[PDB]
Amino acid sequence: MQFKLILNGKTLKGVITIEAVDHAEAEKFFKQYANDNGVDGEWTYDEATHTFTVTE
């Protein structure tokens, strides 16, 4: 399945899309991406479009 993260950072904007075998793995990956990049924001998830957003 495809999933998307929209990053609405203070000085970094982004869109990333992944291929993930299940919903848990996509969640886990975007968790780890958050820890790895020091992302501190408010999160949403839209199941209809498989879209996470994070807004710093």
Residues of this chain that interact with Na ion (CB under 5 A) are 9-12
Can you say whether the dihedral through the CA atoms of 15, 8, 11, 42 is positive or negative? negative
- Which residue number, 9 or 27, has a Cβ lying nearer to Na ion? 9
CB 36 within 8 A of CB 27: no
| Residue 41 Cβ vs Na ion, minimum distance, rounded to whole Å | 9
- Which residue number, 11 or 35, has a Cβ lying nearer to Na ion? 11
Residues in the chain, total: 56
| Residue 11 Cβ vs Na ion, minimum distance, rounded to whole Å | 4
